[PDB]
Scaffold this motif. Sequence first.
Motif, PDB file in Angstrom:
ATOM      1  N   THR A 112       0.822  -1.202   0.000  1.00 50.80           N
ATOM      2  CA  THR A 112       0.000   0.000   0.000  1.00 50.80           C
ATOM      3  C   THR A 112       0.860   1.257   0.000  1.00 50.80           C
ATOM      4  O   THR A 112       1.890   1.325   0.675  1.00 50.80           O
ATOM      5  CB  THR A 112      -0.925   0.013   1.218  1.00 50.80           C
ATOM      6  N   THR A 161      -2.778   4.453  -3.398  1.00 52.42           N
ATOM      7  CA  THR A 161      -3.804   3.430  -3.216  1.00 52.42           C
ATOM      8  C   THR A 161      -4.154   3.264  -1.743  1.00 52.42           C
ATOM      9  O   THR A 161      -4.203   2.154  -1.211  1.00 52.42           O
ATOM     10  CB  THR A 161      -3.361   2.093  -3.805  1.00 52.42           C
ATOM     11  N   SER A 209      -6.757   3.053   1.282  1.00 60.38           N
ATOM     12  CA  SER A 209      -8.108   2.503   1.295  1.00 60.38           C
ATOM     13  C   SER A 209      -8.773   2.506   2.667  1.00 60.38           C
ATOM     14  O   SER A 209      -9.898   2.001   2.776  1.00 60.38           O
ATOM     15  CB  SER A 209      -8.094   1.071   0.745  1.00 60.38           C
ATOM     16  N   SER A 210      -8.151   3.053   3.708  1.00 63.65           N
ATOM     17  CA  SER A 210      -8.744   2.995   5.037  1.00 63.65           C
ATOM     18  C   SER A 210      -8.115   4.058   5.922  1.00 63.65           C
ATOM     19  O   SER A 210      -7.445   4.972   5.438  1.00 63.65           O
ATOM     20  CB  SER A 210      -8.568   1.611   5.666  1.00 63.65           C
ATOM     21  N   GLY A 220     -14.281   4.676   3.614  1.00 67.35           N
ATOM     22  CA  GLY A 220     -13.159   4.686   2.698  1.00 67.35           C
ATOM     23  C   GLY A 220     -12.388   5.992   2.767  1.00 67.35           C
ATOM     24  O   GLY A 220     -12.638   6.856   3.610  1.00 67.35           O
ATOM     25  N   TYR A 247     -19.187   6.890  -5.110  1.00 65.17           N
ATOM     26  CA  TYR A 247     -18.178   6.327  -4.225  1.00 65.17           C
ATOM     27  C   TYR A 247     -18.738   5.291  -3.261  1.00 65.17           C
ATOM     28  O   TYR A 247     -17.999   4.403  -2.838  1.00 65.17           O
ATOM     29  CB  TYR A 247     -17.481   7.453  -3.466  1.00 65.17           C
ATOM     30  N   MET A 303     -16.890   1.768  -3.191  1.00 65.73           N
ATOM     31  CA  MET A 303     -16.303   1.110  -2.031  1.00 65.73           C
ATOM     32  C   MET A 303     -16.904  -0.273  -1.825  1.00 65.73           C
ATOM     33  O   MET A 303     -16.181  -1.227  -1.513  1.00 65.73           O
ATOM     34  CB  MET A 303     -16.489   1.965  -0.777  1.00 65.73           C
ATOM     35  N   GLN A 352     -15.317  -2.584  -4.480  1.00 62.69           N
ATOM     36  CA  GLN A 352     -13.924  -2.896  -4.180  1.00 62.69           C
ATOM     37  C   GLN A 352     -13.809  -3.831  -2.987  1.00 62.69           C
ATOM     38  O   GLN A 352     -12.875  -4.636  -2.919  1.00 62.69           O
ATOM     39  CB  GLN A 352     -13.129  -1.615  -3.921  1.00 62.69           C
TER      40      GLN A 352
END
Lengths: 459, 468, 469
Positions: free
Chosen positions: A50, A54, A56-57, A215, B30, B34, B37
Amino acid sequence: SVLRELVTYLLFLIVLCILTYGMMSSNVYYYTRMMSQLFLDTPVSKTEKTNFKTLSSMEDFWKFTEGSLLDGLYWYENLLLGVPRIRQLRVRNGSCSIPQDLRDEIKECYDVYSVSSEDRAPFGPRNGTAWIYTSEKDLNGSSHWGIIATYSGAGYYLDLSRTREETAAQVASLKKNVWLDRGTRATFIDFSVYNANINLFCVVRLLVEFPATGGVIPSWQFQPLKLIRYVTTFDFFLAACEIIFCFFIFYYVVEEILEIRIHKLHYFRSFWNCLDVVIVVLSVVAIGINIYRTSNVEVLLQFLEDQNTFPNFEHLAYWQIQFNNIAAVTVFFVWIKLFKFINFNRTMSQLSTTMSRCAKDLFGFAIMFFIIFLAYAQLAYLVFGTQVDDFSTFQECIFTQFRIILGDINFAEIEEANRVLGPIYFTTFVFFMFFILLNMFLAIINDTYSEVKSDLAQQ
Amino acid sequence: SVLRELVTYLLFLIVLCILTYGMMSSNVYYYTRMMSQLFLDTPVSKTEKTNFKTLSSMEDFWKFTEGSLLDGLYWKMDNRSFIFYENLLLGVPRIRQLRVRNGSCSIPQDLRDEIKECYDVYSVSSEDRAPFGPRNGTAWIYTSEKDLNGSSHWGIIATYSGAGYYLDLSRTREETAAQVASLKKNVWLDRGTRATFIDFSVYNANINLFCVVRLLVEFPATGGVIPSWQFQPLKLIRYVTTFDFFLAACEIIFCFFIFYYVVEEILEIRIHKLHYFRSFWNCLDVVIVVLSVVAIGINIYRTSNVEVLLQFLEDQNTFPNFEHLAYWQIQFNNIAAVTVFFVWIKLFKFINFNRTMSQLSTTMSRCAKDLFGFAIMFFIIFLAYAQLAYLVFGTQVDDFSTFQECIFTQFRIILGDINFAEIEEANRVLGPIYFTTFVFFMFFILLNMFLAIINDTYSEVKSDLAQQ
Amino acid sequence: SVLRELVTYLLFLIVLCILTYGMMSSNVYYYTRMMSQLFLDTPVSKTEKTNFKTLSSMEDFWKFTEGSLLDGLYWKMADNRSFIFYENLLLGVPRIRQLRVRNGSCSIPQDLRDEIKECYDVYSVSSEDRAPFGPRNGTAWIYTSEKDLNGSSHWGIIATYSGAGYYLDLSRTREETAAQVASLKKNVWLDRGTRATFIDFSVYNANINLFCVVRLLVEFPATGGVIPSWQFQPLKLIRYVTTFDFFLAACEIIFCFFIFYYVVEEILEIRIHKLHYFRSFWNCLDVVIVVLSVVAIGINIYRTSNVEVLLQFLEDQNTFPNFEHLAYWQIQFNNIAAVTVFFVWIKLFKFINFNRTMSQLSTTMSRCAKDLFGFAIMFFIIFLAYAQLAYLVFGTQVDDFSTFQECIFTQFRIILGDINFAEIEEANRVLGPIYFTTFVFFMFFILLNMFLAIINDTYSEVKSDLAQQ
């Protein structure tokens, strides 16, 4: 008669070409790749793949802020230029109206980001300045205009240190006492670099947007700045060219004001005079931005040796972007004005008369073409808006339609998202653009050319 | 006169646009992004690099169900599960398969000494309705379409039905894993299986917007797996905010416009100017009115048919049945998009404010019977080429596997978006001949014929109107 | 009258479509795709990323034969049958076969006859080896004739190979095929003289009624390297099973009756009336359709009447099923049927004259064909000049111009914009950009516009003439 006029304009054109060539080869674009690749492409650690590109959290962001950031900020081989700042914007609990149908399980709601819903209460342990609200004025901040919203300049900020040994400790302290709650909606990181290896500046801005749906959306922008001084002879030549260009445009605006003084009765009925006025206004704004950045580039060297104060250097990047975008369209308009002057022979006279006698008709059909174009774009937005990611916003829909016209279609996700009414839209769009609508411009030009040739022949 | 019609049309267009973008919440992309994904791109396990998009067998499905699915579904802070700490899982998910019976197809007598079983392709007449396995639960017993509250799906291979062998899972993860393990021990997916579905829903109370998920895995009669998915957001608690009340008011106003237009159309079709379809604007108005009435009918039907939500709310430990609502939302969205397109296209009736626009409109109008007459021939040639491409490449390319895919490939050929490394190796002769002749006839003959028709019509119209 | 002709043509078209699209039945694309993905795209081993589509040497081929091939062939549940996807039944045994050339089959210069000792020519029937070699015990080390192998020529990428060679019949289980291939690999079976290697097998899949015939070919050129190719063909050899098959048989009979009627009608209309008969372009289309249809009927009759290989296999199913000629003739029949359907659909233009708008457009096309042919001669001469220049200059370097036909295909793709200018610039930094730029400019600015000039002139002329008269 027009020999001097043409001559002056030609001289003016070569000056612009030399300035653009001097600007085209600054050897900076290589540097911006190899400086952005350090932060946005290096994994957070040896284990995970990561990176900032990219995210993602939230946990991986917490890993990134102690790691791939500090690892690339203290060790091409750029160095620090002050203290960086981290800031966040957040909303307040109870900003919603939970429907009464289901409220026995949903206890907390946080709306999307807005000024009305923004949180101002002191949260967490009130030890420092990151746990208390500071207004936009107290931070000298401005709007950002992000992806899913526009963010103000206020928020909960904290200036880091110059030594990694203490920056890591303070970021770990901010991680321990939970700082990124559920209400967090954006987070900014900014600093400045020098890279003493090659004399060239840069200001950075890193953004992480936390949607209300979960996200993260990572965004970034890198903009270098130049501290150009009298180093080599080519620099002296470029400076002399810039000075003579300033004098030339001064003379040009003198002749323009003379033209508007004697011929004030009618000056906007012709297409070329509008070109002159837009060229002169773009030139004056470009030179204003240039002199502003030249004046303000000397202020920033105070931070090169040691200063524990955050340097506010975003307006410089904004105005550099505007300067570049103005220069591009300015040189394009100058080259079009050159394209005007070719009216020497009878052949070029016929071509120019044809192009001038079919201007109102082409403009008239542009209206119909764009009505149909925007109807199709709106249809695409309403059908593929939620699924495709190429049609998520209206302007992005328009851009995708322009790309499709130039044969850059995908049709994979277009057909996957909607197996019917997607293929229908694509096939009808292609058929009407490539066979019917785009040929009306050519029909107009052809008829005007025939009329002009017949008129001259009978004359 | 014409000004009143123009202003009322403008108001109608404004209220239509407000309605369409009221339910077109910004940055709703989005949420589905999400979700996709999380449930699609995640590898089925830490070691394997396979995900839901690239399933290739049945053990892959069994690894995905006990793997990525149970990870993306259940999160810890019979407690509730918040997906991204914002999305709440409503009730329990449901898994359901469709089967065929041994003997639905017949083996030729020559090979009956080494082949025993024969399972047909999926059809309602060859569907298994019999118990199997350890016959104790509802996962081993057929349940009809009406007793299960389902409907047809229209997958890729065929159009599946709403019946079959189903199982409602649990609210937590520990016992859902046990249920799936028990379904794996006693073989649940035999050679007879023809499809499998998974459905669940989430809420995300921050915005007021449900999401309905369906994951379909088709097992073809030749072996293999074809996975599919669908994520659709819905809003069923409409009246929550002041903008929602504004939208309701606009809905009422739009219904009023549609009623007025229908009354006027009936008046102008019944007694005055009988059979007036000889014009184009009248036909456009008829299409717009019909589409609007269909959209209003769908909205009325599925705006009070939300008793499934109440039935879930009175007991939240069951499976929320939101598939019909999602289907009708999709159909309503399609109808509304087409209606908006046609309402925008109607604007050409009023742009005649100078001589240039009037001349352009006349030229574009008078080239309508010629372009249509040549479009018939263009499409005859186009369909002949598509048929040849389907018959030659229809088994091996993946761009010509179906007739509609053949047509789409051809419009894409014109844009130069092809491989030709797979066309040429599929058939070394008659493949290149196809490509060369198609390119030559598209670019050098028919395009120039379209342009010739347009040029000649424009010149004639301009000359005649100028001289008159 | 014309209505009789129209309805007869419509019935003929309906029957032809029923037949062809009944052959193109429910999705067999997935049947082919599963097999091709199983064999071509599976990596030869866990660590290496090489597959059959990207073989690069002999050791890669030997890894593939002992690796992904056996895994994709034999599946588990006394030496029972193997169902490839638990549904596709492997019929009998697969066969591996190679072709060789002779040592010292070329001419080497006398100035190096002490530095270069052994030489193998390119493949030719006059240069192929026919002698025993190695441990001359079985049939893998002894030449077997084409007649004794019941084979035929293949026409691979490099050359047209023979139906003979050194073959071996594999086993019905993994544990024996692995041992056979290991023994072939130890006692070296693929020397430098090898020029090709074939692998064949067939499957059934009783759930539908459709055979699949697979052939995997690897060519070893004389200059070094490996060129892989493949061929997956579905067949139906047990046609009459369901009622739809009987319907298709009835449609076949009806189509044969239509072809007989058309033949006799055209013969009687060419007998005396209009002895020339060829300057209409509709009679020419009729005779083209008739010839293609009778060729298709003959191929169908002489391929379906010969399923004797299937019977021979059914007598004893421990043998190699010889379904190669059946697949070849199926492919030929498919090609002929596709072309026939194309031309029958094109013949529909004979009846769309119901008003003046279609009549004037048809007249325009008919009257512009005579001039577009004259200009297309020049267009194609210039096209071929460019193609031959590209072949002679970039032919040895670009990979897109290796042959004349590839040059023509590349130019037609350039017209679409499907080209990579970087590759053709690197090959020759000068005369590459010149070729590309001049080609694009003259094709789009000059040649594409003379066609428009001619078409527009003829269209305006005919429209004005009709309006005036």
